[model samples]
Target: RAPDSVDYRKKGYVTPVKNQGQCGSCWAFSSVGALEGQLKKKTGKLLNLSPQNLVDCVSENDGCGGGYMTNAFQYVQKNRGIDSEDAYPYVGQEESCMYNPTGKAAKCRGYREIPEGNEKALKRAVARVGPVSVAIDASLTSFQFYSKGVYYDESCNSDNLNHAVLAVGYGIQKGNKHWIIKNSWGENWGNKGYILMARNKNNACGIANLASFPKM
Candidate 1:
């Protein structure tokens, strides 16, 4: 029987960690991360989708300044596709939309939002669909220097959500269930660019507040 846990990283669905730099482009990273995972699962092709494609092209979200993954997915659907990192590359700085029709890399069908405040739904989606793009209250100081163990910051608030991340898997740690989150702050930031967030805490840090993922 399968264990009551799943780790997309071990399963070859999750991609490597990326750095968003000083830009508030976490949304772009998470959006592309989810899309990449889905594409890998669906097509068996591991691809490094372009965060710059969304950063520069998506009109709904402000480039580098901030944005939503939902808008990124819409931009992909409307624009017909997204490019790879090698083609567009990450500038770490905001630039005008330079999307080229011929350089199109990957295409997404659409995206879906998991029910707000529903951790179970989020886990099921991650297991069945792919990694999820989620927003959370990453303003806490503890979150910035998170190194290991299950993260649980009492100071984090659902109403103060300001950061986007990718939930790649779920597992049990010390008998407590946790969500494996991938950050765009580079590998040195957390547990090799990943964090284990406390689960079943009524949407702690607003993790389940705005969860979503792209469909390949």
Candidate 2:
């Protein structure tokens, strides 16, 4: 069963917001965030996995160009879920894979992908699961400059997902239901590195499309 609301930050399950820099490594960050969330829930300790580990080691991805969450999760499962940021660290670009099998900070099994465009499944996942990795149509300028508040763009597409993000929780603010999303753009963007995206709105920005969560 899922709850009406969940904030992993309040529960100490969420790690700090991370910056992907100028590279196209949002997918890696999203995957790592979801991984960290579940690992925290399982082991009762929050671990900061390496996005650069995924960026350089995940051969199925095109490095900084782009990648998918599921592929990164599979790579993590095979590699014992990569080392910590202090061990492997992030360089914000494509580099040679320095990841080894030893000194792993986290581990993962398979992942669960929510049904496409289903808000109910996504809400339930966020409520029950830790954090969920999701693809969104983030090509809008307003979305890029979003500072705060419940973000709702009517033109946001449900199928043209281009950037990946993590849904940390859900809530209703001033009668507008929204999902508390964690972005990889750094602490300077959105609401202190977070954004409240509309929860039940027409699959806003494709938040539910290709949504997934890593297993612990």
Candidate 3:
């Protein structure tokens, strides 16, 4: 069962996020990621976002699940505008890229971060804007084997190993603090792809909230 309530303050929590599978669709993940944050910030509503929708459309891009958010946002800004999850659902499989039909349906505008302070700006933007796009060192790990209680000890000192996650917020829990994180490895993964990172831990295992957005 999923946790009842999560505190993003001290961050050691994870959310019920979806997975992108073998598709190198990190860019799609980043796009929906920002949308998810923005939607929540705008309406105070939690949305799952749709990477599948992103992978389906967007040229100069690949839906086989590999690309960049800037390209994804550019594609969205130029072509079919972004849409809510209900409008375009996540199929979980990497399909071939095709023309988008969101404009004929429902869509939203996309944005980018100011280069000078992308990370900090993105975080504030999340607090005052949207879900945000983040990248980590998901370098090489048996992440597929993660089941539960994957206590990511910070002192381990490893970089670029298993980069996967999105930071939603910060709060306190278990009489301590943690960063609320979201993952993309499916529900069967770590805490449903949601896990906790200590307030000070920013390593791959811990929550390294290096996120940004497109102002396009």
Candidate 4:
């Protein structure tokens, strides 16, 4: 059963916050983040996988310009596994494919996408499966400058999802329910690289859209 609340960070399941750094590689980070959670869940040892492996090798998604988490997952599965961050360090830019499968740190059988607009299913996935990859409407400046609080903006369009992130957990803050979203914007941004977006509020920022996780 899903808990009333869960924070993967407290359990040390979520990896350290990483920076995309002027790159539109959130998809890679989000995909890798979800897989990392699964890797830790299975082995009891968290390993930082390479988003750079996805960014450079996966031609299905535009390198550093934009991408899809599903495509990234497909690439990892077909390629057997993905290298670690220490081996294929992120440059945050399109570069020559230096992908070495020898440095592989993790693997997943496939992936599963949660039903669109279904936040309850999302909660179950986080509680049962580990961190899940999700898309969001991160266009507002308020979202850009969000430091702390249960972020909710009616102006945030539900159909316009421009950013991908990891939904590590959920909690109730100030008696308001929220999703603990892990962004690829480094530790200084948001609440130490995480945000508590208002949950159960009309799919706040389209947080329920395109939610998914790698198959272990």
**Per-candidate TM-score against the hidden true structure:** 0.96, 0.97, 0.66, 0.98
Clash pairs, candidate 4, are: none
Ten-residue region with minimum lDDT total, candidate 3 = 6-15
The prediction achieving the highest lDDT against the true structure is 4
Clashes of each: 0, 0, 39, 0
Report RMSD (Å) for each prediction in the order shown: 1.4, 1.1, 6.1, 0.8
Q: Please list the residue runs of candidate 2 whose C-alpha ends up more than 4 Å from where it truly belongs after superposition.
A: none
lDDT of 4 by residue, 37-86 (tens): 99888989898999999999999999888999999999999999899999
List candidate 3 segments past 4 Å from native. Answer: 1-16, 43-49, 83-96, 99-110, 114-123, 140-164, 172-177, 202-210, 214-216
Instruction: Give the per-residue lDDT digits (tens) of candidate 2, residues 1-216.
Output: 577778878988789999999999999999999988988889898878889999999999999999999999999988776788888888987999988657588988888899989999999888888789999998999898998789999989887999999988888889999999999888998889999999888899989989998888
Residue 195 deviation, candidate 1, in Å? 0.5
Name the lDDT value of residue 196 in candidate 4. Answer: 94
lDDT of candidate 3 vs native?
A: 0.54
- What lDDT, from 0 to 1, does candidate 1 have? 0.89
lDDT tens per residue, model 1, 35-72: 88988888898889889889888987899889999999
Cα error of candidate 3 at position 129, Å: 2.0
Clashing pairs in 1: none
